[PDB]
Symmetry: C5
Subunit: 312 residues, 5 copies
């Protein structure tokens, strides 16, 4: 069929709305995430009678091949959405109700700085196709936009899901300048990360730090170097549960600082043994007593400085 | 071919039924699982008879393009099901028997607390589109629902497969539609996990604990640190089996407690050596004799408390 | 078109034959594999015949849509096969020759309880739809059953490919159906497993057993714990290819026994050192001399018992 | 629906242009990258010239069918592009307007002689085969060639996206064809590779070097060999990413040099101990004092020479 | 439509030809690779011929569904090729041209008997069925077989791409078929393997060999066991990318020999210590002095013998 003819020079406003259901498969290396959700639309279609009569006040059912369906394309999807219509219901005289379920691989930026304690925003951009009838503009209705409060997004909690009309700036053609933006606010749950990552590494570092209460060079060497090996193994373990991020990160800075501390500890042990052999035991004892207090305080101050630098 | 016309405004009850064939590929990171099964509806027609002659008592077999096949849609599937019709034989009495086969990827939430001893319940939802003549009521046929007793899911044993009628309760009550829920209770076989994971860790921990019968500081340091390295390697080895779970788990708590015990053992060894060097062998011996009984009892009590907290 | 007339009171026999072309991608975790083969059919239809008067060629071609073709459905397949009809020929007496070429992926159980030295059997099931007029039965033609010489599975050698000519009839959903069974026996090529897996483990164990010829406590501790670390590392190489079976296996039993032996060796070393420190060297010497012979004999007997248990 | 007739012998020209949207999934081992963009075309056909003087005022508009759209294909793609048409329009004189959106995966070789600090160039080739009755040649419309401001690649900086105006015509398969070239120049962001890789290995090497201030043989052996093990683990972690090339890169040369330095350090330690045992301590002291200064200077000189060779 | 008339004495002969565009993704464990190429056909049809008079100068250009096109299939492919027709032309005498571009995945065995320095041959098989009226055979058009200059494989270099002109005619399921063989010979780029695998192994072995110049039991144990631990990781790395074979390769034999050497070294160290403790130092000195020369010579001879056995 064909879209309705113009009635009174009033543009055909399409009241769009996304009813999110599922979010999963957040592949971070390619920065893609699949979405399973509904899509509700309503375009006022007066002057095209669809059984308007009091005796026929019943709700009429229409199929996909019954009325003109506006064509809306997602901008940032790898392929066209695989959409199946759930139902189409039209009032005897008034608007039209539409609902369909689709799946699509969406591409949105995913910042990973301050990774354990970060928030993310997901964007879906919508555009409409103008046809032989009057010009079509896009508007959002707040009655249909929302979730079912049973979203199966694990590891994150949804804070808001809103929309706003924004201009479209890409290959402008005096048209198609009424794109839509949908923002999904999510926040990572950071509780399990503490016992899973942070505490064991601190335990390993504190085990390495016990060499300042000993004077046995072999024992100190074994302690520090085997603790470094254990740290490398734990870094291998951690690296798996984390996407490949070719940029600086809070966790990477912490790891680098840990490596630096290991190097400084090795230097201190070597200096102490060298002085003891060269027969300056008072100087060696002074150095080790100073180190016992110096190391944790410097570690804590560096942690505070780095946290302030990264988290405003 | 159209849906049957109404007779006396009696709603038509469709006796649905799902017969499982294959269940496989229970992926937990994506929180999905593919299923291959049957589908049967027992809707009957009254006005539109199908050769109801006594002489032609032979069962009439029809192609899909011979009658009206109801459109049933699954709420929580990624894509539309592949409808592979099996057989459509309609008796001249009036009732219709239908069979088909589909292979759809189902989305269902999973819980991985008490991971080695966990049980899961998988859900399948159904919906039917109302027609403009009258309303279609969804019902459950008890005989049709069942399995073939050769459904093979690796690592799980299937217990029951039942169906109930529940209200839709969706925020988009287009037609006050109904819904169906199919539940598949399963359990995990946990016996192999004991020899595969639990016992080697206990052996490694006891090997670590053998340092309380020795006085050689270098030997004790080597034992404890190499045992810690072995524990880290075993954790890397066993990380490949657990799903990537963004919340706390019984096994994770056990591993964290093991790390804490290693740290405490290192501290105890350091204290013993420091006392011996400071020439307090009585205190050193008292502490090292106390530890031999202190460590296993505290470990057992912590295990009991953790088990009670996680399993009620 | 309509099925052949039921004037022939005897059941309509449909000869069947599957000729393999290649087999590939034998999956272990999902226990599925993909196939590519011909599908032959043959039956007699007196409704359409040929005469030499029309032509002396004695062979008549046809189109799939102009001839009643029985419908054959696979049972244990993830999706529908991709059928490619080749040619249809009609004998002058009414014998029809049908041919196709398909590809599909088959679901079949696997049993890795003798993993290095196990054998498997892959099944393909065929069913035929009943018809109102006549009765349909399935038969097996041995001359149409075979396999190419270029069929190969990476790591397996094919023994035989036969078909059970005995259908297992059953009544499902008030309908009678017939089934066929095609069996493909395979065996795993285990020769490479010996020098790649078994012998290095024996070498490492024999290296660790050398601690019974020395009295230096530190050297014994280093030997035993470092060999334990090496065993843990080698287990990763072993598990990088072994399928994740959630049940008991011969290899898992061997590995668990190895862990137990390591624990017992650590215990023996600790006991010897403790006895030597308390100025009782004769008992320590007796213990180590006894262990030197005790360990290999017990290991051999346990290996024999396990081999008898899992292969008897 | 048919090639336009030439006046006497003139060929036909089509003006193209690609507007990027986003680039992602740039593989290093596979040497492939994905893309999705807009494709614009324009060509002149005087057979369907519009006449606004008498027959209508508005210019012609069409649909994806019932109009000839020339065959435009990509040479270096794995599969045919997935495209959907967005707009078609026809000018009164005869020139046509076309637009579509596509997504494809492109094959292009990469050069890793300067892997941490390298820049690449990606090629996209278009082509069209001349039909019998009318040769076709391509052209570039600079007003349409460009990239979106949101075009971002993870870890790369985009510098330019231009097209070579001159086509490369050649006779292939007894037909004349024309080819366009699109070039995308990018540069890697190298900062994050410094603290993640470069510095930890230097720290480990210095920890290894620290053994020249010691005279205990066991401590030196422990230091050097454990640092070698740590280097091996780090090298495996690094090599998990970079692919293998027929030529020699920079990182591989650095790693090989580090291995050589470790071997020489082990040799020096063994020589020092052997000389000390034979009661010649002065030579051992001279050798170790020489090595203390010899090693870092040679390391620095070799690094400078490698930097000059690879980047000069 | 219809097969060409068998008025000509010879059977129907089709001239084929494949022109490679690019090859990629040569999987090693699955023994597969992907291809993108053209496909040209040519045969003789007595009908459809036309006279250059009556506008017959224009050579006819039909489309599929208007002529009889022979069915040609690839034997060793996982799925049917994704093909699109390019152009069909008919010469006035009666010969028919044909062109088509496709992409497919090919199955072909490999031979890793000389894995680092091996050469492979890849096969693509074309087959054709037979029709009732006439018989069909294949041929090779020499001037239509070739490859682009941009055909590159990652890790290999392409030598030649020819075709065996002699078909293999045989009867398969009561019909005669003809087959063609296309061979692609490639050689491996082995330069990257030497400085990444071979030399570090030799360095580690030489480092472990330094225990023959020492007399301290603990240092020797540490050296040998830590070198074995380092060797195991390289074994894992090498075995990751090399599949399992029923025969014995070169690298596996080298690795097994290295394991044997490590075991013998451990035995020698233990024997030396046992003799030294027993107050027999001269015999131990003789043993270690003999071993110093014995080990490298035996290693060199064994390497030479293995190289002669596998490559000669
Ligand atoms: C030194 C620091 C030791 C105390 C640190 C405790 C921090 C919390 C922690 O790691 O807990 C892990 C774990 C239990 O976690 P739950 O709180 O039961 O998790 C379920 C509820 N979310 O702690 C233990 O098992 C403690 C063992 C003693
Ligand atoms: C954070 C940095 C942690 C570094 C590692 C801690 C090492 C502690 C060793 C202290 C030690 O040996 O002291 C022995 C000392 C000697 O006794 P006198 O008072 O002289 O009689 O005895 C003690 O202090 C008894 C032990 C008390 C507990 C020691 C550890 C407590 C802190 C643990 C870390 C918490 C985080
Ligand atoms: C010497 C005796 C060795 C007996 C070994 C028996 C054996 O291997 O049985 C394994 C068997 C099941 O077979 P798998 O295939 O491993 O099943 C799980 C999948 N991996 O597992 C078990 O036995 C389960 C564990 C229960 C028994 C545990 C025995 C513990 C013994 C402790 C001895 C301590 C010695 C102290 C000396 C003082
Ligand atoms: C569980 C925790 C296990 C930690 C390790 C326990 C074994 C330490 C070694 C004990 C030791 O040296 O005892 C020597 C002691 C000396 O006897 P006198 O009184 O001097 O005569 O002899 C013995 O105890 C004999 C050997 C028995 C050791 C086996 C004990 C069982 C250990 C594993 C239990 C199962 C888990
Ligand atoms: C140790 C100190 C920290 C490591 C050195 C920091 C390197 C950053 C230097 C800037 C590199 C980029 C740049 O603009 O330099 C120019 C140039 C690249 O530009 P094109 O020639 O176009 O390519 O870069 C170079 O030549 C840099 C190469 C030498 C310096 C980097 C070497 C660092 C690692 C080697 C030493 C340690 C061994 C491990
Ligand atoms: C790049 C560097 C690569 C090599 C690094 C090896 C480690 C540095 C040397 C550690 C031991 C130095 C040492 O023993 O010096 C002690 C020596 C003793 O004093 P005298 O009275 O002269 O005797 O000097 C000191 O105490 C000075 C302090 C030494 C540490 C400062 C140097 C740190 C180097 C970082 C690089
Ligand atoms: C490659 C084959 C296997 C190599 C194993 C590693 C080689 C170890 C060599 C150690 C040499 C050693 O300890 O002896 C040093 C010995 C010192 O003894 P002198 O008193 O000078 O004369 C001997 C009579 N008293 O001689 C030397 O200093 C020679 C220098 C050793 C260079 C070794 C180079 C090895 C290169 C391998 C490639
Ligand atoms: C098969 C089971 C293998 C069990 C594990 C074996 C552990 C290693 C064997 C012991 C090595 C040390 C032997 C030793 O020190 O022998 C001393 C002994 C001293 O002799 P007398 O002074 O007369 O007494 O030295 C010798 O001459 C013994 C010869 C030993 C070398 C040959 C060893 C062969 C081992 C084969 C292991 C199985 C394959
Ligand atoms: C000293 C300790 C060992 C260090 C060196 C270990 C590695 C040695 C490997 C030698 C090697 O690969 O030689 C193989 C190589 C090839 O053998 P073919 O099979 O005949 O060649 C193929 C063409 N027909 O053999 C030779 O070239 C032998 C020539 C003498 C080698 C050096 C002897 C001195
Ligand atoms: Cl879309
Ligand atoms: Cl569905
Ligand atoms: Cl099927
Ligand atoms: Cl294309
Ligand atoms: Cl094909």
């Amino acid at each position: 069929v064909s879209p309705p003819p113009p009635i009174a020079d009033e543009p055909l406003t399409v009241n769009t709305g996304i009813y999110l259901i599922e979010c999963y498969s957040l592949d971070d290396k390619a920065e893609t995430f699949k979405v399973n959700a509904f899509l509700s639309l309503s375009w006022k279609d007066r002057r095209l009678a669809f059984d308007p009569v009091r005796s026929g006040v019943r709700v009429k059912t229409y199929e996909p091949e019954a009325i003109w369906i506006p064509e809306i394309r997602f901008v940032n999807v790898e392929n066209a959405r695989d959409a199946d219509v759930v139902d189409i219901s039209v009032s005897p005289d008034g608007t039209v109700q539409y609902l369909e379920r689709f799946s699509a691989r969406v591409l949105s930026p995913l910042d990973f700085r301050r990774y354990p304690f970060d928030s993310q925003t997901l964007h879906i951009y919508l555009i409409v196709r103008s046809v032989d009838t009057r010009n079509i503009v896009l508007a959002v209705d707040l009655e249909k936009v929302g979730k079912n409060d049973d979203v199966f997004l694990t590891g994150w909690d949804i804070e808001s899901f809103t929309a706003v009309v924004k201009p479209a700036n890409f290959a402008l053609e005096d048209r198609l300048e009424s794109k839509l933006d949908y923002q999904l606010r999510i926040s990572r749950q950071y509780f399990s990360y503490i016992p899973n990552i942070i505490l064991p590494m601190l335990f390993i570092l504190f085990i390495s730090w016990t060499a300042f209460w000993s004077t046995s060079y072999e024992a100190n060497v074994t302690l520090v170097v085997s603790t470094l090996i254990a740290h490398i193994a734990f870094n291998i373990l951690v690296e798996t549960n984390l996407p490949k991020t070719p940029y600086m990160t809070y966790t990477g800075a912490i790891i680098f600082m840990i490596y630096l501390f290991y190097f400084v500890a090795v230097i201190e042990v070597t200096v102490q043994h060298y002085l003891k052999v060269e027969s300056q035991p008072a100087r060696a004892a002074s150095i080790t007593r100073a180190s016992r207090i110096a190391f944790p305080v410097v570690f804590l101050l560096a942690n505070i400085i780095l946290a302030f630098l990264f988290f405003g």
